[PDB]
Amino acid sequence: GRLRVVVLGSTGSIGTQALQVIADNPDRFEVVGLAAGGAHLDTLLRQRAQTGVTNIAVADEHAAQRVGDIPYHGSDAATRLVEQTEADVVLNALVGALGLRPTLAALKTGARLALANKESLVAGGSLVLRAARPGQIVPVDSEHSALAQCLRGGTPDEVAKLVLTASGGPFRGWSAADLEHVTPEQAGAHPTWSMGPMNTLNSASLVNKGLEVIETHLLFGIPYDRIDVVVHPQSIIHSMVTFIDGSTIAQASPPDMKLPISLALGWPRRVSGAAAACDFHTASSWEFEPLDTDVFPAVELARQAGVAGGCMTAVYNAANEEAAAAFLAGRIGFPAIVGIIADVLHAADQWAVEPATVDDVLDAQRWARERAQRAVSGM
Amino acid sequence: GRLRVVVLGSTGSIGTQALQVIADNPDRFEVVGLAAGGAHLDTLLRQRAQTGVTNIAVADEHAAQRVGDIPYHGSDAATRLVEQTEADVVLNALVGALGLRPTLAALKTGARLALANKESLVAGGSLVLRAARPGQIVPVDSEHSALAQCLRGGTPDEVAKLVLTASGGPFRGWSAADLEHVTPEQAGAHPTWSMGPMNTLNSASLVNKGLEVIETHLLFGIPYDRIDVVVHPQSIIHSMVTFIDGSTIAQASPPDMKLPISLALGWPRRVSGAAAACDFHTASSWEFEPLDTDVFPAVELARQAGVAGGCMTAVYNAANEEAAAAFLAGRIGFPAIVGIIADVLHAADQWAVEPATVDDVLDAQRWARERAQRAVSGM
């Protein structure tokens, strides 16, 4: 049948790619709701005009002032749209901790949640896990999509290890000394039209991978000491599962987020023609190498935060957003990003308590930002 | 819940590894029968003592006499052992088309046929398929084990291509001129697997991969034009499935037959500790290259034979067996193996008819052997 899809964060990278998948597959999907922040209001309005979807939300009231016919506007507009729209699938492609309430609202409706928003799991943690029922959350991230597919190769009891792949970033194989003179521009900070500056940076520092490791644990229920990371520079293998007999199952495709997006939308049904397959007509190789955890401890710190539990992973992530932005502003060096994350985490044991509300999560993040700010400033 | 296993070809490469898996897993498996040719009585008597199984078949009459009190002896011994032994699993690890009657007898008992002896399925074709219920034949070779595991990654309608990997043999990358000089000693070594003499030779000539393409079509029902072959020198990836959305799912492990053996014996349940997993704490690469079909046409010839159908795959295999014997005896050169296969197949018009009985298959093989000898006589 046809799936009714609410797209939250419709004007972003994931949201617009999802809309292309949906436009290409009118037999499988219909859009029944769109939500955006308001900074790309003009795009949202064009999306209404193109799709005919009038069921739209804009977070920014100023932005909403410019139109006069937005059904949902202002604070919690996305949450209100979710609560009042009948849908089969909610795609949460919101950015930041503001994706958390809409995730909670979506889960309550009993719709499938195609989840891109990282903070929903990294920060929301047990709050989101307790609200979700088995199979309700389908991950959009290419690594987690890869794992979901590879886990089909046996029962849950047959899993030995989850193995995530990492590109290694621009500083792959760089020594600690090399890393000292890393500049913002080198860390991939360009004024790129779609990609945020934090995405290349988080990939470069291996924090993105630390975040994906935390989400892997929460999504798939595998202990942190059984979640490995291997460096794979080609980014063709998106992740692997190693089973108790010694068999490894791997997912492979040329990079293209439309593959994992399409499958998260249509889960468990694959979407024909979503992306190009690996081609074996020309000679190639898939390389693997270990990560030097002494030079790149971001993944180890993510495991420490995840093992501690509660709001510790919210602290990990909020510490990074602060430390990473400080690096981008010249206020710290590159190696100091993960150094600050570790310093903030070491002081954060009060946040190991489980969050009862969204407000507990925000408080932890608030504390973590302030703590990182003091570490950056010297105060 | 212990599975009773009859092991045919117990003294060989697969047979001994299978006994090792069973010895390591008395919880899951018991040996209840052993069959061998009689050329290695040392090993067989050792196996009798260690397993405590006296229910034994020896093909060679003189060899069985030397031992004394062997219950089944002569060329029908393995077949009669199967017909008269109660078991849950028959592991057919015999070599050559001589495994046909034990394969048919095994299937007739209703036991699972764990098939190492792909030649009997290649030879039997639809005759063997009509004898089996769905899922009764469970492949032991790494390729089809990999395919079966990877096919769990989607539903049947989602399968676009099956991708078999080939090591390429010791002569991977060699020219046709280079191949002229190949000796049985050179062809008797394999870069990645340790196997019996016939599979070692067939891997050097690429006839093994040709036989596996036919096996894939017969076991999985996939058309010949959707079965790809790619050369992978490391033999770590054992085969892959490409799905309609562009996703590829692959199975990988250090070459060790104990892995696919364990899974075939216990299907669908994986056997804990069977084999070592891929190790990602040290650098490695998985390489792919196309097969040079001009230098190695054995897979294309297998395709032509498979497409023709009926008794034509029995002809392909039987031609190979004769040519291979002539190469190993010093009568013909290495390139003449696939040359003779081509010459015999292209004279084999009458053999596209579907076998109604075993005798149809026997007739096709008899014709093919005679025709192969004529080709040998001509050089």
Ligand SMILES: NC(=O)C1=CN([C@@H]2O[C@H](COP(=O)(O)OP(=O)(O)OC[C@H]3O[C@@H](n4cnc5c(N)ncnc54)[C@H](OP(=O)(O)O)[C@@H]3O)[C@@H](O)[C@H]2O)C=CC1
């Ligand atoms: N991009 C990728 O390739 C990948 C992304 N992810 C994760 O998926 C999530 C989204 O990715 P991405 O599409 O790149 O993010 P983007 O920045 O590209 O798009 C974010 C979307 O959120 C909207 N938004 C911001 N604030 C609000 C609000 N208060 N209410 C409603 N909507 C709002 C924005 O609207 P507006 O534009 O008008 O401000 C925009 O449409 C992130 O958490 C990211 O970590 C995971 C794997 C890879």
Ligand SMILES: NC(=O)C1=CN([C@@H]2O[C@H](COP(=O)(O)OP(=O)(O)OC[C@H]3O[C@@H](n4cnc5c(N)ncnc54)[C@H](OP(=O)(O)O)[C@@H]3O)[C@@H](O)[C@H]2O)C=CC1
């Ligand atoms: N070896 C491997 O790693 C792999 C094997 N295969 C397949 O498995 C099958 C066997 O492999 P492999 O172990 O190497 O073969 P082997 O040469 O190592 O052993 C063959 C076995 O069959 C027995 N045998 C030979 N002739 C007769 C006969 N006339 N009657 C009854 N039994 C007989 C032999 O007993 P004896 O010699 O003591 O008289 C021996 O135990 C092949 O079809 C091959 O294609 C598939 C994938 C990989």
Ligand SMILES: O=CN(O)CCCP(=O)(O)O
């Ligand atoms: O399981 C192991 N094999 O089937 C051996 C494959 C050898 P080849 O790829 O060279 O045919």
